Amino acid sequence: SVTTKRYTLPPLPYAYNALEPYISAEIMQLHHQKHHQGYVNGANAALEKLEKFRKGEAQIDIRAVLRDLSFHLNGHILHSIFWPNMAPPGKGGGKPGGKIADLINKFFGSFEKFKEEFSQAAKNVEGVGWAILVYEPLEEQLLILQIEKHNLMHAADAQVLLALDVWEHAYYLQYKNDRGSYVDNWWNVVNWDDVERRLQKALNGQIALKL
Amino acid sequence: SVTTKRYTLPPLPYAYNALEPYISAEIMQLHHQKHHQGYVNGANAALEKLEKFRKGEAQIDIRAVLRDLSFHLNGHILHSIFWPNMAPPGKGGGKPGGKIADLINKFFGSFEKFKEEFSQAAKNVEGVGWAILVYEPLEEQLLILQIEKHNLMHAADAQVLLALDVWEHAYYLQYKNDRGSYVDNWWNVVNWDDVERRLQKALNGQIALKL
């Protein structure tokens, strides 16, 4: 018996227009319905090829399919964090509080310095990718990392707490080439409650999904 | 107030010659004292630059330093797993048992198919890198991934259970260009108890470290 677990597109936690004016309904719709859906589809396509190989039903270029899986699986995972990382202005935006504020102050000095560091990491991704805030479980610290594509430069075992997508399709329709203004405006929709919930799990030595 | 947590070289769980003749005493000594040491130093060097930056003390090429951090931090994590992943012949090397055996059977059909898929993965790494078995927490399944260098193609949030280093320095002194037979002999030193300990943590929703 051989099984693979398949992936599905999660619904947004809010309406397509809920993050306006900071991210347009048009972007939200395309980004979720087309781009995120495509990564779910691609991940499942790679799994089907692997399962067929595991069954002894077909051959496989192992490198090619695992490269494909890594790309799409990561697109799916990062977007799945990205949506609840944001919230309509009110629930979204402003400064953090609770444990996340304290830990940000601890490792980065202040929220202002963290904001600068995270923004600069996002603005300076070469090509397409992400800025992420992770909890590194080995020495138990917050780190900012750049991710290229969806799958390059992750820290093994690390838990993603906050993710900012700087693929051109995350902003181009509204901001055009001005990724900087997009990054700066995105702070207005950060759902700190979600980031806090992720950090709480991470601090307890747990995987920070499925809140 | 700014802090960063620094990394340290862990001792091997055994002697340098404990994995002989499957992997050389010379390789063990160089691999750990020189190669793994380098990654610790590299990670700490990156942290210093970030810490200095966070204090508004110096400037930074944030892309460069985060690239450096990603490479070296991953070097340090993967090797930190790699050593206890192995055990002296007898204690190490056999067929899996418990939950790891059953889940391997569930997703791959048999241990034989898994062993084939994992070996194909390790032998077909383009350039230097790793073959890894992860627990993927989103749909809760085992996956094999190829890693290039130390930091390319990880699955975000996923827990590393088993890792094989196929960087040339992991084998060349003993096996020369013959990576295939190095991968083949490595099975004889696999510590299935360690992998089981990591899988149980992952199943618990915990980080597969510290145990």
Place this chain on the structure above:
Amino acid sequence: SVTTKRYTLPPLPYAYNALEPYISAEIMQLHHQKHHQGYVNGANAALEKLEKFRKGEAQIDIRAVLRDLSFHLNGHILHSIFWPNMAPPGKGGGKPGGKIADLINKFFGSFEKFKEEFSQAAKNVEGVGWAILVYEPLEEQLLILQIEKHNLMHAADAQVLLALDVWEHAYYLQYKNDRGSYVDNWWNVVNWDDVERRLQKALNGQIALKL
């Protein structure tokens, strides 16, 4: 005495709206005035850092600056080919003639199959990048390659004859996520005379950039 030669943005060979309706004037303006200009600026910035190093005037993270140079210099070179690779419909579009048609038939069987393979390569670039047709001088043959970002997967010494940009900024404002329709519409503006001129140089074992 230390010198570096600096790069400059070439003017377009036609008006911004000359490729309508296949590529909008809005895209052409941003793509040239912002995106291409940025690569020129980035390549010159990396050179100034290298020049300061060569003067013994400043220290340098050599890996970082050389990665930066490679990215930007390639962005500049590929865009510099991209623009004259296209022409207003009439001069642009249709099927190739002369030596290019013959060599396409020799290596690909027909212009139909070539166009199929080139379009598929473009559509299937993972993340951002290019499809290119090159002359490979060592064994003297046409090859299609996928380029990721601007600088990943080029053939050393090979001459670029035809280049198609599939970075999202090349099409997103007009075609949104539908890269496939962008790729298909682009054939209508291909400047075959320019491709022929490049092939003519490459066939004599010449560098095929400046004619």
Place this chain on the structure above:
Amino acid sequence: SVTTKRYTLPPLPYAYNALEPYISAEIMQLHHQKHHQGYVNGANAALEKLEKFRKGEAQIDIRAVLRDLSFHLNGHILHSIFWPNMAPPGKGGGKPGGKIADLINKFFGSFEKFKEEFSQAAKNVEGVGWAILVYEPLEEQLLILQIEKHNLMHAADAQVLLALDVWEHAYYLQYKNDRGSYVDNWWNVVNWDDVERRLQKALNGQIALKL
């Protein structure tokens, strides 16, 4: 009619032990007979898959195959330049003369400054790769570039004049982890005559191969 031109392994210009004590006989033999042969084999295997698709004979993962082709073709091209780039001690490996010396002085200030930049580039390659010196035809200057694997970070259209392999298999049997002393010692075998012939070709606007 569909054709692909296939590749072949070139003989070394000298005996395996001809570069001792700087690069060992054992290394020269494995490096050429095993590693370089593998790249020739891989390039032809990829071309066979492409040829089969062009005839409409089989389906293809165009991204996978073109990735494979890029890696192995570049392996083959760079190793082909690598061997004649070197010569037995004395018989070639001191300081450059003629045009190569003049342009090195022009762009790097002096040979000593060039040597430092080239050495530093090679020593600071992350993972496996190359340091190369290229003639960049757009602004007609010399540049040093780092290459990762065989195919990452080349400059489109540029002509490779000098290549230094820093893949681990290029030095590990003799130098172990000490890549630095290998890079330092390689200068004793550089064939500046070969480099000069490549430069003159690039200056003529020719591809820097076949002589």
